[PDB]
């Protein structure tokens, strides 16, 4: 990769008029500095390597914070439905484009702390992060039979270790991930009542990628410990297919809705610099 | 010369004498499904000239105070002849579009319309409840819908409207309207052109899709500069939208889906 060199230009006096154009056509006028001013020869050594879509998306973004407790029977297990849409940064970066297709590198950073003073100390905890594909049974208790994980993928993490890492492939049932969906899941048909045929706008599949179930494997210590598993999401092998303007007002929900922050630009006069 | 153009598609002909050069969206002409990309196994119907023809949508009125207009594809052609019948008789459908917007005014008028083609043109709702807009308002037909100058919550809890509230500078989706130019677009500037032509390929994450559930393309027309004329009272000029579907193919023939209305 290399940018084109700036070519040298003398003064022009010609019928060729590159400065005038027509934005009614929808074409951008593809000018260089050689077309409007006198230029010297410059061999250009800058590259656009850091502005590729792979370089744009090769960062890990925090996507969920999953709270879980180790306690005498309050939150002994937690389930989180997998989506990027509840953290704004990776959502905005993905929502530059309409369709995408990437492999995905999950990373789990676990932190834990005591929550009371008197009741002794605790040994090192083991954390299980079970993937529940959509249709596999959700646990009802922390010691349910669902944690036997005969077919579900399951990372066992020991506290104090480096953060656990998982690759998943492109799992989408379509040929690309649809960031935006201008449609419904159901069409209401004539003669159906008002309780039938309704579906959310922009929803598509209501459980698209399943969920992660987090528990502490250990039995309860006499002191309550509270743990937070932070889930870090880094796209790789990224392809993107239809560019969109980025989001200008604060996000409100999974859709494109807005209610607050509708005045994003500040006040500056027309002729002040 | 490039100002004069003729488009002919299945016993419909459009001629124009003040055209800007037409846009093929993303450099891709519409095409049929290749055998390396086909998902359904059944034989598609290809209606050709019975469906691939220009249909004229209902005329909207441009005014000085007006905010802008929007349509959805293929939803705006759901009552247009054999294309609408083939859409409602089949589970899966795919079409590209040629979109022609007509707006003629005199040399003493001024104003400019940006005509934007948006893939997956989602529009924001009217209430604090997320994703709540019903089918009958998100699929309005050929009358389309209008942008609004400001956001307004629906306070009615008993009979909620479940409508869109597309704010014009927010482009109905929370993005800046000046940044809408990365979509395929033309500008009808009344001193130079009176028409805009956008040829749109089928753009989706699937090779074919349920047309009654899902809309591939949206057409948004926003006044970039307002309409003005020297008469002290008022002025109005018509805008006409003429759309031909292109490379139509349909799979999954069954009984007719009659969707719910009002």
């Amino acid at each position, epitope marked *: 990769n290399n940018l084109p060199d700036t070519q040298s230009s003398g003064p022009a006096h010609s019928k060729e008029t590159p400065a005038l154009t027509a934005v009614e056509t929808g074409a951008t006028n593809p000018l260089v500095p050689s077309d409007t001013v006198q230029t010297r020869h410059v061999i250009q050594k800058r590259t656009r390597s850091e502005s590729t879509v792979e370089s744009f998306f090769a960062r890990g973004a925090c*996507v*969920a*914070i*999953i*709270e879980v407790d180790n306690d005498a*029977p*309050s*939150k002994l*297990f*937690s*389930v*989180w*439905k997998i*989506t990027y849409k*509840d*953290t704004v940064q990776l959502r905005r970066k993905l929502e530059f484009f309409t369709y995408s297709r990437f492999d995905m590198e999950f990373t789990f950073v676990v932190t834990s702390n005591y929550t009371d003073a008197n009741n002794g100390h605790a040994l090192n905890q083991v954390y299980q992060i079970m993937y529940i594909p959509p249709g596999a049974p*959700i*646990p*009802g*208790k922390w010691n349910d039979y669902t944690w036997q994980t005969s077919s579900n993928p399951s990372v066992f993490y020991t506290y104090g270790a480096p953060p656990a890492r998982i690759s998943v492939p492109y799992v989408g049932i379509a040929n690309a991930y649809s960031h935006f969906y201008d449609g419904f899941a159901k069409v209401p048909l004539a003669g159906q009542a008002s*309780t039938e045929g*309704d*579906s*959310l706008y922009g929803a598509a599949s*209501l459980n698209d990628f399943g969920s992660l179930a987090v528990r502490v494997v250990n039995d309860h210590n006499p002191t309550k410990l509270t743990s937070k598993i932070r889930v870090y999401m880094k796209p790789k092998h990224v392809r993107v297919w239809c560019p969109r303007p980025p989001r200008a007002v604060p996000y409100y*929900g999974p859709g494109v809705d807005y209610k607050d922050g509708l005045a994003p630009l500040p006040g500056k006069g027309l002729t002040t610099y | 010369s490039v100002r004069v153009m003729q488009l002919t598609l299945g016993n419909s002909t459009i001629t124009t004498q003040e055209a800007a050069n037409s846009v093929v969206a993303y450099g891709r002409w519409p095409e049929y499904i290749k055998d390396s990309e086909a998902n359904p196994v059944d034989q598609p119907t290809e209606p050709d000239v019975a469906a691939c023809r220009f249909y004229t949508l209902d005329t909207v009125t441009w005014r000085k105070e007006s905010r802008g207009w929007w349509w959805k594809l293929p939803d705006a052609l759901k009552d247009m002849g054999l294309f609408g019948q083939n859409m409602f008789y089949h589970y899966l459908g795919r079409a590209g579009y040629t979109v022609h917007v007509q707006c003629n005014a005199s040399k003493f008028h001024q104003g400019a319309l940006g005509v934007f083609a948006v893939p997956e043109m989602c529009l924001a709702g009217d*209430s*604090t*409840t*997320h*994703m*709540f807009t019903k089918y009958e308002n998100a699929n309005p037909g050929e009358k389309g819908g209008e942008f609004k100058g400001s956001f307004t919550l629906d306070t009615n*809890a*008993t009979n909620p409207a479940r409508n869109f509230c597309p704010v014009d500078y927010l482009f109905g989706s929370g993005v800046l309207a000046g940044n809408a130019f990365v979509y395929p677009h033309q500008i009808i500037n009344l001193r130079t052109n009176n028409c805009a032509t956008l040829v749109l390929p089928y753009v989706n994450s699937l090779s074919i899709d349920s047309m009654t559930k899902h809309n591939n393309w949206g057409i948004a027309i926003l006044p970039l500069a307002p309409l003005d004329f020297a008469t002290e009272s008022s002025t109005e000029i018509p805008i006409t939208l003429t759309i031909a579907p292109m490379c139509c193919e349909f799979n999954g023939l069954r009984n007719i889906t009659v969707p719910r209305t009002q």
Partner: antibody
Amino acid sequence: LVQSGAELKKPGASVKFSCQASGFTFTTYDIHWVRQAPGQGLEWMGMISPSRDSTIYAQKFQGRVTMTSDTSTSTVYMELTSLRSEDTALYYCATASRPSAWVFRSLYTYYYMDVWGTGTTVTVSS
Amino acid sequence: QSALTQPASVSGSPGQSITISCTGTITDIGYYNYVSWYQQHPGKAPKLIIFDVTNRPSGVSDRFSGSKSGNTASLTISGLQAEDEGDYYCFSHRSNNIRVFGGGTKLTVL
């Protein structure tokens, strides 16, 4: 432990509810208000969150009600700015402390109401 | 809709099994797993009997069970006994962050 303040009657004028709880549940958990007309069923009225000084009102009562907190004595208050004859009801103070397993948004825990107070009847008649 | 719909009264013999339905819409039951059930006797504060879908609090007997079918939910009491006579309330979370109760169901034992 959850305590509810007295029982009341007047027509027209404003009425102030009071609910006092233990310090741990005041520090950690949200307080929900529920009303119930005789034989007519439960109606949600709103939430007050003394852990982060936040409150949410139901849409039927959003112009009328206001919730406040008393951080030095673990007490929350519920004030109805005007009264109507339909407001003749038994009222409940509830603490949300049963956690859902499902993560709310992707950053928070959701709690169901599982500890309920003794309650307060208010009648609105001449 | 606002309030979630419930049947007004359900009757059953001892030892039989009853189902009490709760039909909402796409923004409370059809979107969230935060669907719960309560049991109320005369003069008593309500007691939580099901908190997540299919999940029971400690101390609630195993004859109470529930499930989701999309936009509607149900509570099943199997092998009905005379202490189960009372009023049963559905509960759910709407996506505008308001909470909503059901209309109640007076269950009487024949």
